[PDB]
Amino acid sequence: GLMQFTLPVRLCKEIELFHFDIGPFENMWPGIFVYMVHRSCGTSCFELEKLCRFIMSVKKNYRRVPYHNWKHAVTVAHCMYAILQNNHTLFTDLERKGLLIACLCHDLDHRGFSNSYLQKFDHPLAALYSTSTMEQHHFSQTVSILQLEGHNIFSTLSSSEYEQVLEIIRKAIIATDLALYFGNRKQLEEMYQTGSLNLNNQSHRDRVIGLMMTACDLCSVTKLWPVTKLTANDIYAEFWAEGDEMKKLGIQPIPMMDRDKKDEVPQGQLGFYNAVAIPCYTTLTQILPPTEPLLKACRDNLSQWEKVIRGEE
Ligand SMILES: CNC(=O)c1cc2[nH]c(-c3ccccc3)nc2cc1NC(=O)c1nc(C)ccc1C
Ligand SMILES: [Mg+2]
Ligand SMILES: [Zn+2]
């Protein structure tokens, strides 16, 4: 009850900023996450005996892959933390509880391969869930860990509060399927421009929570340049690995994943910032003005990639 977590001063200050990096010390990430729940939700939201055992179970069910790892789960969780703290009064008690757990769980038991690669491999998980394949799996694995003796961090919720929080988490994890992002942003775009966006419309909060999740999951591109650049290596190490496995199934992989076309990479970063990253945080900024620092950071980094091409690094 009376046991706060307390970070070193530099972390105590930087963590509140959007562009904070959670650092190379694995053992401090659970403290960081727990810190963010207490400040975001209340000291009282979850039993600490139980939260700690849910954290360490989730930590274990992320694999040792180059990008889609435990450091991603906490990084994404942190960016939602920043969004929630800068939009204090826009979100229910339940949404703040469910959304931080969603982000920590959003990529559970990821193997470093796209939904596309699962379908062309004929992995079983592709037979079991035709669309948003990894994403239905991640939610699945989330409800597993919630149901281990001693891991139900929600058991003090009422029947119907519990039913709402599991429904928030599911939509949130499904919304991380980038394939559904493009359609979701467009609807939110029209709704904000035609003035029809209504945050008490539940189907509308859903859409907005969808965009938030996309923005947190892409937040790699919203860090200072040297974090963005070094993360790109991790992202591309999975992509080229999947390309290698595409080639083993006798398919030429798309250039994004072909290690032979590293040269074309800076240009592929341009298309990505232009087609996905910039729009995402633009639309987010319009709906949630306090999230403008993400948009600014993303633009600074688009500008760093333009330099990489122009020979200037
Ligand atoms: C949907 N589209 C994308 O995700 C994309 C497409 C690309 N095409 C090329 C490319 C390369 C060499 C030659 C031609 C083309 N690089 C690409 C990188 C991409 N994404 C990320 O970097 C990326 N993806 C996530 C989910 C989080 C962060 C990042 C930073
Ligand atoms: Mg994912
Ligand atoms: Zn992710």
Curated annotation (Swiss-Prot):
Domain free text: The tandem GAF domains bind cAMP, and regulate enzyme activity. The binding of cAMP stimulates enzyme activity. Composed of a C-terminal catalytic domain containing two divalent metal sites and an N-terminal regulatory domain which contains one cyclic nucleotide-binding region.
Subunit-level organization: Homodimer.
GO cellular component annotations of the record: cytosol; glutamatergic synapse
Span covered, complete protein: 724 to 1036 of 1055
Gene designation: PDE10A
Highest taxon of the lineage: Eukaryota
Annotated transmembrane regions: none
Protein name according to UniProt: cAMP and cAMP-inhibited cGMP 3',5'-cyclic phosphodiesterase 10A
Active site location: H68
